Design an enzyme around this catalytic site. Structure first.
Site, PDB file in Angstrom:
ATOM      1  N   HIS A 142       0.828  -1.201   0.000  1.00  0.00           N
ATOM      2  CA  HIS A 142       0.000   0.000   0.000  1.00  0.00           C
ATOM      3  C   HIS A 142       0.866   1.257   0.000  1.00  0.00           C
ATOM      4  O   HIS A 142       0.638   2.189  -0.784  1.00  0.00           O
ATOM      5  CB  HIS A 142      -0.929  -0.041   1.223  1.00  0.00           C
ATOM      6  CG  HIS A 142      -1.752   1.196   1.441  1.00  0.00           C
ATOM      7  ND1 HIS A 142      -3.132   1.207   1.332  1.00  0.00           N
ATOM      8  CD2 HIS A 142      -1.400   2.455   1.793  1.00  0.00           C
ATOM      9  CE1 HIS A 142      -3.577   2.425   1.592  1.00  0.00           C
ATOM     10  NE2 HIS A 142      -2.547   3.202   1.865  1.00  0.00           N
ATOM     11  N   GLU A 143       1.852   1.313   0.888  1.00  0.00           N
ATOM     12  CA  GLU A 143       2.676   2.517   0.975  1.00  0.00           C
ATOM     13  C   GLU A 143       3.511   2.712  -0.285  1.00  0.00           C
ATOM     14  O   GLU A 143       3.606   3.830  -0.808  1.00  0.00           O
ATOM     15  CB  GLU A 143       3.563   2.512   2.228  1.00  0.00           C
ATOM     16  CG  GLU A 143       2.848   2.266   3.558  1.00  0.00           C
ATOM     17  CD  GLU A 143       1.721   3.217   3.918  1.00  0.00           C
ATOM     18  OE1 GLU A 143       1.442   4.188   3.203  1.00  0.00           O
ATOM     19  OE2 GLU A 143       1.092   2.948   4.973  1.00  0.00           O
ATOM     20  N   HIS A 146       1.666   4.268  -3.099  1.00  0.00           N
ATOM     21  CA  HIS A 146       1.550   5.725  -3.106  1.00  0.00           C
ATOM     22  C   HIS A 146       2.665   6.369  -3.925  1.00  0.00           C
ATOM     23  O   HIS A 146       2.442   7.387  -4.578  1.00  0.00           O
ATOM     24  CB  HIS A 146       1.562   6.289  -1.693  1.00  0.00           C
ATOM     25  CG  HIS A 146       0.256   6.164  -0.973  1.00  0.00           C
ATOM     26  ND1 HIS A 146      -0.928   6.654  -1.479  1.00  0.00           N
ATOM     27  CD2 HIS A 146      -0.042   5.654   0.240  1.00  0.00           C
ATOM     28  CE1 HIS A 146      -1.904   6.420  -0.620  1.00  0.00           C
ATOM     29  NE2 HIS A 146      -1.391   5.820   0.435  1.00  0.00           N
ATOM     30  N   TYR A 157      -4.377  14.421  -2.776  1.00  0.00           N
ATOM     31  CA  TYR A 157      -4.755  13.657  -1.580  1.00  0.00           C
ATOM     32  C   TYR A 157      -5.862  14.340  -0.767  1.00  0.00           C
ATOM     33  O   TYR A 157      -5.709  14.657   0.404  1.00  0.00           O
ATOM     34  CB  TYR A 157      -3.530  13.378  -0.725  1.00  0.00           C
ATOM     35  CG  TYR A 157      -3.671  12.169   0.144  1.00  0.00           C
ATOM     36  CD1 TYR A 157      -3.708  10.891  -0.402  1.00  0.00           C
ATOM     37  CD2 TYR A 157      -3.751  12.290   1.514  1.00  0.00           C
ATOM     38  CE1 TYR A 157      -3.822   9.769   0.397  1.00  0.00           C
ATOM     39  CE2 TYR A 157      -3.873  11.176   2.325  1.00  0.00           C
ATOM     40  CZ  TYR A 157      -3.899   9.918   1.764  1.00  0.00           C
ATOM     41  OH  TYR A 157      -3.998   8.838   2.607  1.00  0.00           O
ATOM     42  N   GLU A 166      -6.157   6.444  -2.281  1.00  0.00           N
ATOM     43  CA  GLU A 166      -6.193   5.424  -1.236  1.00  0.00           C
ATOM     44  C   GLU A 166      -6.630   4.062  -1.772  1.00  0.00           C
ATOM     45  O   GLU A 166      -6.030   3.032  -1.443  1.00  0.00           O
ATOM     46  CB  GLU A 166      -7.126   5.878  -0.114  1.00  0.00           C
ATOM     47  CG  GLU A 166      -6.424   6.661   0.940  1.00  0.00           C
ATOM     48  CD  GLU A 166      -5.318   5.834   1.535  1.00  0.00           C
ATOM     49  OE1 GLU A 166      -5.574   4.691   2.006  1.00  0.00           O
ATOM     50  OE2 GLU A 166      -4.179   6.304   1.476  1.00  0.00           O
ATOM     51  N   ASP A 226     -10.129  13.625   7.870  1.00  0.00           N
ATOM     52  CA  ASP A 226      -9.412  12.644   7.050  1.00  0.00           C
ATOM     53  C   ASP A 226      -9.250  13.146   5.613  1.00  0.00           C
ATOM     54  O   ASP A 226      -9.436  12.406   4.645  1.00  0.00           O
ATOM     55  CB  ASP A 226     -10.139  11.292   7.106  1.00  0.00           C
ATOM     56  CG  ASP A 226      -9.412  10.161   6.368  1.00  0.00           C
ATOM     57  OD1 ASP A 226      -8.157  10.119   6.350  1.00  0.00           O
ATOM     58  OD2 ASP A 226     -10.122   9.288   5.832  1.00  0.00           O
ATOM     59  N   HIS A 231      -9.668   7.816   3.462  1.00  0.00           N
ATOM     60  CA  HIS A 231      -9.644   6.421   3.901  1.00  0.00           C
ATOM     61  C   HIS A 231     -11.035   5.861   4.164  1.00  0.00           C
ATOM     62  O   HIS A 231     -11.158   4.692   4.565  1.00  0.00           O
ATOM     63  CB  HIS A 231      -8.836   6.256   5.188  1.00  0.00           C
ATOM     64  CG  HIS A 231      -7.405   6.650   5.070  1.00  0.00           C
ATOM     65  ND1 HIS A 231      -6.958   7.914   5.384  1.00  0.00           N
ATOM     66  CD2 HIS A 231      -6.312   5.942   4.699  1.00  0.00           C
ATOM     67  CE1 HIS A 231      -5.648   7.969   5.203  1.00  0.00           C
ATOM     68  NE2 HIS A 231      -5.234   6.786   4.785  1.00  0.00           N
TER      69      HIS A 231
HETATM   70  N1  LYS Z   1      -3.494   4.525   7.466  1.00  0.00           N
HETATM   71  C1  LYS Z   1      -4.806   5.054   7.816  1.00  0.00           C
HETATM   72  C2  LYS Z   1      -5.497   4.206   8.871  1.00  0.00           C
HETATM   73  C3  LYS Z   1      -5.029   4.416  10.261  1.00  0.00           C
HETATM   74  C4  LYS Z   1      -3.853   3.592  10.540  1.00  0.00           C
HETATM   75  C5  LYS Z   1      -3.480   3.753  11.965  1.00  0.00           C
HETATM   76  N2  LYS Z   1      -4.257   4.712  12.802  1.00  0.00           N
HETATM   77  C6  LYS Z   1      -4.740   6.500   8.251  1.00  0.00           C
HETATM   78  O1  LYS Z   1      -3.653   7.081   8.372  1.00  0.00           O
HETATM   79  O2  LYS Z   1      -5.805   7.079   8.474  1.00  0.00           O
HETATM   80 ZN    ZN Z   2      -2.597   5.224   1.991  1.00  0.00          ZN
HETATM   81 ZN    ZN Z   3      -2.189   6.091   4.010  1.00  0.00          ZN
END
Ligand code: LYS
Ligand code: ZN
Ligand code: ZN
Ligand code: VAL
Ligand code: CA
Ligand code: CA
Ligand code: CA
Ligand code: CA
Ligand code: CA
EC number: 3.4.24.27
Length: 316
Positions: A142-143, A146, A157, A166, A226, A231
């Site tokens: 996933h990372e 990006h 974003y 995402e 967010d 997310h």
């Molecule tokens: N990676 C996501 C989910 C949370 C991961 C840990 N709190 C975010 O930054 O929102």
């Molecule tokens: Zn991400």
């Molecule tokens: Zn992320």
């Protein structure tokens, strides 16, 4: 560092033994010269200065508890590189074999991981919400995805483009997890989330609502938290991707599944040929339809299934 390529052995976050590509020059470093211009893993030493120190080890054996997050960050970066090269003919995240850098032991009790514009960064977790986050292959992929997005579509974003950003990372994180083919699923982060609770995860692509995320455009989040729900609203696109691959009937709309490989081809082409920084969900649908048309033809089942899946999640 300049040195000779070596093969070390260690244990990852989940207790599994694996070989890692290292480089020897006085110490053995987590520097894999076998992939592009290298994969480099660093120790942030519980601080937030990045990248920290290139990981050095006296004996090329990485079985200490402190070593486990580094083993997995390094190894899973290699798997992710292999997926993009072997499946999509892409050489690293920039297409030109850029060095891949990761830091582990970021901060204290840090319950997250991220791409910071230049490298991957992994917390250790607090031991209750998370264990060290590089233990999840879907998290690592996933990372790194990006970074791929950064260099290709460049999806901003925030709001819908950010939710696509995402979802692309969740989709390819999951496809990398299936590529490695150790306990693959359509859940995100299950291997590192809540060690005291079995069967949960951070997000679900097969049923986003299980964790409070929308599975239909009519349920999208429109507030400011967010980054506008990047997310959260990713669940709408994750559900569409799941349906394209696996099929199903969702809010009464039936989708014929076409499988993971074709899902990956369609979304990779959309990401690299059609999406732009400002693409919204409707523009993603159009990009996916055009990508499937290019690959399989306008009359194909693949195109029909893309349309049914976006219909099922309410995206026109
Ligand atoms: N990676 C996501 C989910 C949370 C991961 C840990 N709190 C975010 O930054 O929102
Ligand atoms: Zn991400
Ligand atoms: Zn992320
Ligand atoms: C923790 C991880 C999955 C990611 N940085 C979020 O989502
Ligand atoms: Ca050692
Ligand atoms: Ca040792
Ligand atoms: Ca899994
Ligand atoms: Ca998973
Ligand atoms: Ca758990």
């Amino acid at each position: 560092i300049t040195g000779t390529s070596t093969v070390g052995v260690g244990r990852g976050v989940l207790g599994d033994q694996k070989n890692i590509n290292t480089t020897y020059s006085t110490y053995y470093y987590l520097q894999d010269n076998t992939r592009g211009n290298g994969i480099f893993t660093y120790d942030a030493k519980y601080r937030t200065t990045l990248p920290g120190s290139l990981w050095a080890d006296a004996d090329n054996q990485f079985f200490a508890s402190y070593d486990a997050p580094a083993v997995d960050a390094h190894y899973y970066a290699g798997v992710t590189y292999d997926y993009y090269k072997n499946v999509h003919n892409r050489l690293s995240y920039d297409g030109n074999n850029a060095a891949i850098r990761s830091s582990v032991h970021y901060s204290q009790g840090y319950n997250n991981a991220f791409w910071n514009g230049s490298q991957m960064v992994y917390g250790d977790g607090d031991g209750q919400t998370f264990i060290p986050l590089s233990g999840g292959i879907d998290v690592v992929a996933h990372e790194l995805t990006h970074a791929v997005t950064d260099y290709t579509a460049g999806l901003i974003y925030q709001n819908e483009s950010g939710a696509i950003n995402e979802a692309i990372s969740d989709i390819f994180g999951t496809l990398v997890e299936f590529y490695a083919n150790k306990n693959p699923d359509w859940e995100i982060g299950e291997d590192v989330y809540t060690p005291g609770i079995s069967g949960d995860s951070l997000r679900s692509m097969s049923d986003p609502a299980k964790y409070g995320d929308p599975d239909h455009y009519s349920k999208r989040y429109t507030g400011t938290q967010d980054n506008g729900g990047v997310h959260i609203n990713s669940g709408i696109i994750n559900k569409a991707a799941y349906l394209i691959s696996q099929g199903g009937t969702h809010y009464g709309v039936s989708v014929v599944g076409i499988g993971r490989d074709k899902l990956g081809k369609i979304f990779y082409r959309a990401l690299t040929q059609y999406l732009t920084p400002t693409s919204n969900f409707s523009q993603l649908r159009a990009a996916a339809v055009q990508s499937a048309t290019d690959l399989y033809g306008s009359t194909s089942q693949e195109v029909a299934s893309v349309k049914q899946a976006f219909d099922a999640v309410g995206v026109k």
